Ligand binder design. Structure first.
Ligand SMILES: [Zn+2]
Ligand SMILES: [Zn+2]
Length: 426
């Protein structure tokens, strides 16, 4: 049974659920941030995502274009009080996800999808834990009273937002190989996934709409549930953990029959993640290329796994990990003892990864309102200042609380009804 840990930002490090972590991209730089283990293989670091950015990037542009979509605030998540609040909110969102069997299943899949200890450029006959793609360093406090540096394996690390507060994103660790960028999370191996997330700002939408000509209102607005935005990102995490993150890839098969707000190029990764009819916007030709590509990555991984005879880390049980990967990749064993890909089992696994968890279906399972298609206008996003108040949002129903008669018709998400639940960004 999955357990969601509890803690306050001010609690002291304990070498277990609370630690000082040297994030993957700070490997060897000796820069640590306080981190909290929400659950096995998942860590939360209440800090702004400043990786690969500059101090000035957090400040607004040179008098922005009239596109009130990207919001900024360099002072967000900077104090201990801000971080604790952020931490309590993430714990609540995770409990909300866990309290629904469908969310629980998502978390479970993610937790068990551990990155392979190696990649296309590591020693094929040895499990490798010495890489920021699978491990991060930390400071540990030991009985003798001395502080030492150690390493740890994980699946996901969630940071606060980057420059843009309302722009949740998920990326796998990038490796530098032969002066090129290599993503193990796209090669079947998977890797630590990182998320930049902000639970306070959510987008708005209106399904009941069809060309509001000679109009200005057409009331029917709804704000999104932060838990669904989180699960949305978690789906991206799932794809990466299995090494199936879809790289830039998406043109225009048939973009017109959709009715909501627009039509413009995007990434297949987004369409798969959103699900619903949007997934059908990816041509069968492209779906077949992706499928064949991943099948090939998995066959290469089965051949590698079959070669593993040692590991650099003495704390790793070789056979135990071999069994974990056999289960993860759904490999069979021929009479020769070699690991092989079973076509039917692969297809079932592939389907569960690309189609089994989607924003549209999860919204349905959670009684959370969603938009028709991923294709929508840059509607002004709103802010949810009180997620910690059960009278506004609880971990079993979100905003759609039956005791307040806000369950029916997702009234808890209806901007004209649950007026106090949100605030317009200034
Ligand atoms: Zn509209
Ligand atoms: Zn997405």
């Amino acid at each position: 049974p999955i357990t969601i840990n509890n803690f306050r930002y001010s609690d002291p490090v304990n070498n277990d659920t609370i630690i000082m972590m040297e994030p993957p991209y700070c490997k060897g730089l000796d820069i640590y941030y306080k981190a909290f283990k929400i659950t096995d293989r998942i860590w939360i670091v209440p800090e702004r995502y400043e990786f690969g950015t500059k101090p000035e990037d957090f400040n607004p542009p040179s008098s922005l274009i009239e596109g009130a979509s990207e919001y900024y605030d360099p002072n967000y998540l900077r104090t201990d009080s801000d971080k604790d609040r952020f931490l309590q909110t993430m714990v609540k969102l995770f409990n909300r996800i866990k309290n629904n069997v469908a969310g629980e299943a998502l978390l479970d899949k993610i937790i068990n999808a551990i990155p392979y200890l190696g990649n296309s450029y590591s020693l094929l006959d040895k499990f490798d834990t010495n890489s920021n793609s699978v491990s991060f360093n930390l400071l540990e406090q030991d009985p003798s009273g001395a502080t030492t540096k150690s390493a740890m394996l994980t699946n996901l690390i969630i940071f606060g937002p980057g420059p843009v507060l309302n722009k949740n994103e998920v990326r796998g660790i990038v490796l530098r190989v032969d002066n090129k960028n290599y993503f193990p999370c796209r090669d079947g191996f998977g890797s630590i996934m990182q998320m930049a997330f902000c639970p306070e700002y959510v987008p708005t939408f209106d399904n009941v709409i069809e060309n509001i000509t000679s109009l200005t209102i057409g009331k029917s607005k709804y704000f999104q549930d932060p838990a669904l935005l989180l699960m949305h990102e978690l789906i991206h995490v799932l794809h990466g953990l299995y090494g199936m993150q879809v790289s830039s890839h998406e043109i225009i098969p048939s973009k017109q029959e959709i009715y909501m707000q627009h039509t413009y190029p995007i990434s297949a990764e987004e369409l798969f993640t959103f699900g619903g009819q949007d997934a059908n916007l990816i041509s069968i030709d492209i779906k077949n290329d992706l499928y064949e590509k991943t099948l090939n990555d998995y066959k290469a991984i089965a051949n590698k796994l079959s070669q593993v005879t040692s590991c650099n880390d003495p704390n790793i049980d070789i056979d135990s990990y071999k069994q974990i990967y056999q289960q993860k990749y759904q490999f069979d064993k021929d009479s020769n003892g070699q690991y092989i890909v079973n076509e039917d089992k692969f297809q079932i696994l592939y389907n569960s990864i690309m189609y089994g968890f989607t924003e549209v279906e999860l919204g349905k399972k959670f009684n959370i309102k969603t938009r028709l298609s991923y294709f929508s206008m840059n509607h002004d996003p709103v802010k949810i200042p009180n997620l910690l108040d059960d009278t506004i949002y609880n971990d079993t129903e979100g905003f759609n609380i039956e005791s307040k008669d806000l369950k029916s018709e997702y009234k808890g998400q209806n901007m004209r009804v649950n007026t106090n639940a949100f605030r317009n960004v200034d």
